[PDB]
Design a binder for this molecule. Structure first.
Ligand code: BCL
Ligand code: BCL
Ligand code: BCL
Ligand code: BCL
Ligand code: BCL
Ligand code: BCL
Ligand code: BCL
Ligand code: HEC
Ligand code: HEC
Ligand code: HEC
Ligand code: HEC
Ligand SMILES: [Ca+2]
Lengths: 308, 32, 38, 50, 39, 50, 39, 39, 38
C-alpha cells in the first residue's frame, strides 16, 4: 500500500486481467466481423439435402426434342414399368430424378430422334440397366423402407440415392472413411441378422470376434455422423430400448438383400446389375442419419414407391 | 455453441494449472 | 533478484506472439481477402 | 547499482534493467507505427466494414 | 544481476526463427497457390 | 573484461559477448537482404495478392 | 566468460543438418515429382 | 582443455554409419526398383 | 587407457549376433528360397 511493490502488484494484476478479457473480446469481434455465416441447407421440394440444378448437362437439342415428343405424343408409347403416367409426367420425372440423379444428358440412354426406340443405337444397354434399376428401387422401398414407422419421415429411395450425381465410378468404401480401420475391411454381409454380431456373454467367442464387431460398429457411427449412443444405452449394449437399433436391423437386412440379389445373384458377379460393387451404409447415408439424396414423401412415381 | 463463453471456461480450466507451476518455479529459484 | 520484470516481459511476448498467430490463421481461413488463393 | 535510474522506480529497476526497458519501449512504439500503416494499407485494399 | 543472459536470448531467437520458417513453408506449400513440387 | 565494450553498454555485455553480438547482427543483416531478394523474385514469379 | 562452448554449437549444427537432410529427402521421395526409385 | 574426446567421436561415427547403412538397404529393398530378393 | 579391449569385444560380439539374426529373418520371410516349406 505504502511501498511501490504493493502498488505495482495491484496494477499488474488489474492490467493482466483487463488485457486478457480485451484480447478475447477483440479476437471475437474480428472473427464475427470477417467470417461469413454458414449457408442454409437446400430447400428443394424433392430431395432432402440434394439439388438437380444447374441443369447444364442437358443440351438445348435434348429439350427441343423432348418438347416435340410431348407435343406429338400425349401418352407414352412403349413403357414396361412406369404405368399410369402421361408423357408430360414421364418427362418431368426423367428430367428431375433420372438424368438429374446421375447428372447426364438424355442421350446417355435414349435416342433423341425417337424416345420410344429400343435398339439400333450404341446406348441400349444403358436403358436396359436403367429399367432394371427402376425395378430394384421399387422392390427396395416397397418391402424394406415400408417396415419403418411414420416417425422417421416416410422418405423414398430414388436414383439420386446411391448415385449423388454420378453415373459410374461409385465408391461404397472411400479411403476417407477408413481412418482407424484396415484398408480392406468390408461389411460382413454373409451373416444373418439379428445375431450376426452378438458377442456379449458368449463362451464360444473371443477377442477376435469382438474386434470384428467393433469394426462394423465404428463404420455404422461414421455413416450416421453420430456417436455410439444413437442406437445404444452404453450401460448395456444388448438392450433394445432405442428405436434406431430396430431401424438398423431392418437396414442390415436390406443391404444384405442388395448384396445377395443385385450385386452377386446366385453367387456369380456376372449376373448382377452392379459392377461387383458391394453396398455399405455410407453409400446412401453420406454422414447423415437421413440420406441427402432421399426423396420426400409423394415425390416418386407411385409404381416405384412404398404405397403399392 | 456460444464460443465466447466456452473460451472463458477454457481459460479458467487453464488457470487451474497455475499453483503447481508456481510451486515448480519456487523450488527451482530457491535451490540454486 | 526481482522476478517481476522478467516474468512480465516474457508473458507479454508470449501473449503477443500467440495473438498474432491466431488472428493470422483466422483471417486466412475466412476467404474475405484474396491472399493465398489457387 | 542504482545510477541513471530515477529514484521513483529505484526499488524496482537497476541500470541494466533501465537500458533493457528503454529498448523494449522503443520497440513497442516502432511496432505500433508499423501496425497502423499496415491496417491503413489493408483497408485501402479491401474494406471490412460496409 | 542482468535481467537477461545473452545466451538465453540467442537460443530463444534461433529456435523461434527456425520454427517460424518451417511453419510458413508448410502453410505456403499446403495452400496450393504456387506450383512447386507438382506431378 | 570490459575493454572493447563501449562505455554505454558496459553493465550489459562482456568482452566475448560483444564479439558474439557483432557476429549475430551481421548475420541478421545478411539474412534480411537475402529475404528481400527472395520475396521480390517470388512476387515476379507469382503474385500472392490479387 | 564465454557465453557458449564450441562443442555444443558443433553438436547442435550436426544434429540439425542431419535431421533437415532426412526430412527433405523423405518429402521429395513421397511427392512423386522425380522419377528416382520406381518399380 | 580439449573440446572433443576422440572415443566419443569414434563411437558416434560408428553408430551413425551403421544406422545409415541399414536405412538405405531397407529403402532400396522395399522400393521394388531392383530385382534382388524376389519370389 | 582411452580404449578398453573388453568393451570393443563385447560390442562386436553383440552386433554380429544381432546382424546375423536379422539377416536370417529377412531372408526367410522374403520367400525367395525353398527353405522349410510345409
Ligand atoms: C490479409 C492479411 C495480410 C496481412 C495483414 C497484417 C496486419 C493488419 C498486420 C500484420 C502484421 C504482421 N504480419 Mg501480416 N499480413 C499478411 C500476411 C503475412 C504473412 C504471410 C507469409 O502471408 C506473414 C509472415 C505476415 C507477418 C506479419 C508480421 C510482420 C506482423 C506480425 C507482427 C508480430 O508477430 O508481432 C507479435 C510478435 C511478438 C510480440 C514477438 C516478437 C518479438 C521477437 C521476435 C521475439 C524474440 C526477440 C527476443 C530478443 C528473444 C528473447 C526474448 C527474451 C528477451 C529472452 N503477414 C496478409 C497479406 N499483417 C501486424 C504488424 O504488427 O505489423 C508489423 C499487423 O498489424
Ligand atoms: C485487416 C484485417 C483484419 C485485421 C487483421 C490483423 C492481423 C493479421 C493482425 C492484426 C493485429 C492487430 N490488430 Mg487487426 N485487423 C482488423 C481490424 C482491427 C480492428 C478494428 C476495430 O477494425 C482493431 C482495433 C484491430 C487491432 C489490432 C491490434 C490488436 C493489432 C495491432 C497492434 C500491434 O500488433 O502492434 C503491437 C506492436 C508490437 C507487439 C511490437 C512487436 C512487433 C515487432 C516489430 C516484432 C515483429 C516480429 C518480426 C516479424 C520479427 C522479425 C525478427 C527479425 C528477423 C530479427 N484490428 C481487420 C478486421 N490484425 C496484429 C496482432 O494481433 O499482433 C499482436 C496482427 O498480426
Ligand atoms: C513470397 C511467398 C510468401 C511468403 C513466404 C515465406 C517463406 C517460405 C518464408 C517467409 C519468411 C518471411 N516472410 Mg514471407 N511470404 C509471403 C508474404 C509475406 C508478407 C506479406 C504482407 O505479404 C510479410 C510481412 C512477410 C514476412 C516475412 C517475414 C516474417 C519473414 C522474413 C523474415 C526474415 O527476414 O528472415 C530472414 C532469415 C533470417 C534472418 C535467419 C537467418 C537465416 C540464415 C542466414 C540462413 C540459414 C540457411 C540454412 C539453414 C543454413 C545453411 C546450412 C550450412 C551448414 C551453413 N511475408 C508470401 C505469402 N515468407 C521466412 C521466415 O519466416 O524466416 C524467419 C520464410 O522462411
Ligand atoms: C554454424 C557453423 C559453425 C561455424 C561455421 C563457420 C564458417 C563457415 C565461418 C565461420 C567463421 C567464424 N566463426 Mg564460426 N562457426 C561456428 C561456431 C562459432 C562459434 C561458437 C562459440 O559456436 C564462434 C565464437 C565462431 C567464430 C567464428 C569467427 C572466428 C569466424 C569469423 C566470424 C565472422 O567474421 O562473421 C561475421 C560475418 C558474417 C556473419 C557474414 C554474414 C553471412 C551472411 C549470411 C552471408 C550473406 C552475405 C550478404 C548477401 C551480404 C551482406 C553483408 C553482411 C552485412 C556481412 N564460430 C559453428 C559451429 N564459422 C568464418 C571464418 O572463419 O572466416 C574464414 C567463416 O567463414
Ligand atoms: C533438387 C530437388 C529439391 C531439393 C532437394 C534437396 C535434398 C534431398 C537436400 C536438399 C538440401 C538443400 N537444399 Mg534443396 N532441393 C530443392 C530446392 C531447394 C530450394 C528452392 C528455393 O527451391 C532451396 C533454397 C534449397 C536449399 C537447400 C539447402 C538448404 C540444402 C543444401 C545446402 C546444405 O545445407 O547442405 C550442404 C551440406 C553441408 C554444408 C554439410 C556437409 C556435409 C558433409 C558432406 C557430410 C555428408 C555425410 C556423408 C554422406 C558421409 C560420408 C563420410 C565419409 C564416410 C567420411 N533447395 C528441390 C525442391 N535439397 C540438402 C540438405 O538439407 O542438407 C542439410 C539435402 O539433403
Ligand atoms: C546403387 C543402389 C542405390 C544405392 C544403394 C546404397 C546402399 C545399399 C548403401 C549405399 C551407401 C551409400 N550411398 Mg548409395 N545408392 C544409390 C544412390 C546414391 C546416390 C545418388 C544421388 O544417386 C548418392 C549420393 C549415394 C550415396 C551413398 C553414400 C552416402 C553411401 C556410401 C558412402 C559411405 O559412407 O560408405 C563407405 C563405408 C565406409 C567408409 C565404412 C566401411 C565400414 C566397413 C569397412 C564395412 C562393414 C564391415 C563388414 C560388413 C563386416 C566385417 C566385420 C568383421 C571383420 C567380420 N547413393 C542407389 C539408389 N547406397 C551405403 C551406406 O550408407 O553406408 C554408410 C550403403 O550401405
Ligand atoms: C546367400 C543368401 C543371402 C545372404 C544371406 C546371409 C546370411 C543368412 C548371413 C549373411 C552374412 C553375410 N553376408 Mg550375405 N547374403 C546375401 C548376399 C550378400 C551380399 C551381396 C552384395 O549380395 C553381401 C555383401 C553379403 C555380405 C554378408 C556379410 C555382411 C556377411 C558375411 C561376412 C561376415 O561377417 O560373416 C562371417 C561371420 C563371422 C566372421 C562371425 C563368425 C563367428 C563364429 C565363427 C560363428 C559363431 C556361430 C557358432 C554356432 C557359435 C559357436 C559356439 C560353439 C558352442 C563353440 N551378403 C544373399 C542375399 N548373408 C552373415 C552375417 O551377417 O554375419 C555377421 C549371415 O549370417
Ligand atoms: C438412362 C439413365 C436414361 C436417361 C439418361 C434418360 N432416360 Fe428416359 N427412359 C429411360 C428408361 C429405362 C425408359 C423406359 C421406362 C420403362 O418403364 O420402360 C425411359 C423412358 C422415357 C420416355 C417414355 C417414352 C415412351 O415410352 O414412349 C420419355 C418421354 C423419356 N424417357 C424422356 C427422357 C428425357 C426427356 C430425358 C432427358 C432429361 C431422358 N428420358 C433421359 C432411361 C433414361
Ligand atoms: C443404390 C441401391 C442404387 C440405386 C438406388 C440406383 N442405383 Fe444405379 N447403380 C448402382 C451402382 C452401385 C451402379 C454401378 C456403378 C459403377 O461404378 O459401376 C449403378 C449403375 C447404374 C447404371 C449403369 C452406369 C453405367 O453403365 O455407366 C445405370 C444406367 C443406373 N445405375 C441407373 C439408375 C437409375 C435410373 C436409378 C433410379 C431409378 C438408379 N440407377 C438407382 C446403385 C444404385
Ligand atoms: C446404429 C447405426 C448403431 C450404432 C451407431 C452402434 N450400434 Fe452397436 N449394434 C447395432 C445393431 C443393429 C446391433 C445388433 C447386431 C446384430 O447382429 O444383432 C448392435 C450390436 C452391438 C453389440 C453386441 C450386442 C450384443 O447383444 O452382444 C455391441 C457390443 C455393440 N453393438 C457395440 C457398439 C459400439 C461400441 C458402438 C460405438 C462404436 C456401437 N455399437 C454403435 C446398432 C448400432
Ligand atoms: C440406400 C439403399 C440405403 C442404405 C445402403 C442404407 N440406408 Fe439407412 N436409410 C435409407 C433411407 C431412404 C432411410 C429413411 C427411410 C425412412 O422412412 O425414414 C434410412 C433410414 C435409416 C435409419 C433411421 C434414421 C433415423 O433417424 O431414424 C437408420 C438407423 C438407418 N437407416 C441405418 C442404416 C444402416 C445401419 C445401414 C447399413 C447397414 C443403412 N442404413 C444403409 C437408405 C439407406
Ligand atoms: Ca486405415
Amino acid at each position: 500500500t505504502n511501498t511501490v511493490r504493493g502498488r505495482f502488484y495491484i496494477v499488474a494484476g488489474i492490467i493482466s486481467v483487463v488485457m486478457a478479457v480485451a484480447s478475447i473480446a477483440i479476437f471475437w469481434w474480428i472473427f464475427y466481423t470477417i467470417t461469413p455465416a454458414p449457408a442454409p441447407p437446400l430447400q428443394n421440394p424433392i430431395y432432402v439435402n440434394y439439388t438437380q440444378e444447374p441443369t447444364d448437362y442437358i443440351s438445348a437439342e435434348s429439350l427441343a426434342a423432348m418438347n416435340a415428343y410431348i407435343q406429338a405424343n400425349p401418352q407414352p408409347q412403349a413403357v414396361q414399368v412406369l404405368k399410369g403416367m402421361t408423357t408430360a409426367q414421364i418427362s418431368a420425372y426423367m428430367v428431375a430424378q433420372v438424368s438429374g440423379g446421375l447428372k447426364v444428358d438424355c442421350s446417355y440412354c435414349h435416342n433423341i430422334a425417337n424416345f420410344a426406340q429400343q435398339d439400333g443405337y450404341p446406348n441400349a444397354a444403358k436403358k436396359v440397366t436403367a429399367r432394371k434399376m427402376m425395378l430394384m428401387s421399387a422392390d427396395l422401398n416397397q418391402n424394406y423402407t415400408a417396415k419403418l414407422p411414420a416417425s422417421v419421415g416416410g422418405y423414398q429411395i430414388t436414383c439420386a440415392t446411391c448415385h449423388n450425381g454420378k453415373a459410374a465410378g461409385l465408391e461404397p468404401y472411400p479411403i476417407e472413411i477408413m481412418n482407424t480401420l484396415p484398408n480392406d475391411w468390408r461389411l460382413p454381409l454373409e451373416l444373418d441378422y439379428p445375431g450376426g454380431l452378438v458377442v456379449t456373454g458368449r463362451k464360444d467367442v473371443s477377442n477376435h470376434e469382438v474386434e470384428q464387431n467393433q469394426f462394423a460398429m465404428y463404420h455404422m457411427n461414421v455413416s450416421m455422423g453420430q456417436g455410439c449412443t444413437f442406437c445404444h444405452n452404453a450401460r448395456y449394449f444388448p438392450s433394445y430400448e432405442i428405436a434406431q437399433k430396430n431401424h438398423s436391423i431392418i437396414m442390415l437386412q436390406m443391404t444384405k438383400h442388395i448384396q445377395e440379389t443385385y450385386v452377386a445373384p446366385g453367387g456369380r458377379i456376372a449376373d448382377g446389375i452392379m459392377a461387383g460393387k458391394s453396398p455399405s451404409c455410407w453409400l446412401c447415408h453420406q454422414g447423415a442419419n437421413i440420406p441427402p439424396g432421399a426423396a420426400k414423401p409423394g415425390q416418386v412415381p407411385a409404381v416405384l414407391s412404398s404405397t403399392p | 455453441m456460444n464460443w465466447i463463453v466456452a473460451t472463458f471456461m477454457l481459460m479458467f480450466v487453464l488457470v487451474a494449472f497455475l499453483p503447481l507451476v508456481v510451486s515448480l518455479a519456487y523450488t527451482w529459484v530457491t535451490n540454486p | 533478484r526481482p522476478f517481476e520484470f522478467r516474468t512480465s516481459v516474457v508473458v507479454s511476448t508470449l501473449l503477443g506472439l500467440v495473438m498474432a498467430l491466431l488472428i493470422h490463421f483466422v483471417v486466412l481461413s475466412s476467404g474475405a481477402f484474396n491472399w493465398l488463393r489457387a | 547499482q542504482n545510477d541513471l535510474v530515477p529514484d521513483q522506480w529505484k526499488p524496482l529497476f537497476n541500470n541494466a534493467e533501465w537500458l533493457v526497458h528503454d529498448i523494449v519501449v522503443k520497440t513497442i512504439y516502432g511496432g505500433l507505427i508499423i501496425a497502423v500503416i499496415a491496417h491503413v494499407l489493408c483497408w485501402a485494399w479491401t474494406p471490412w466494414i460496409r
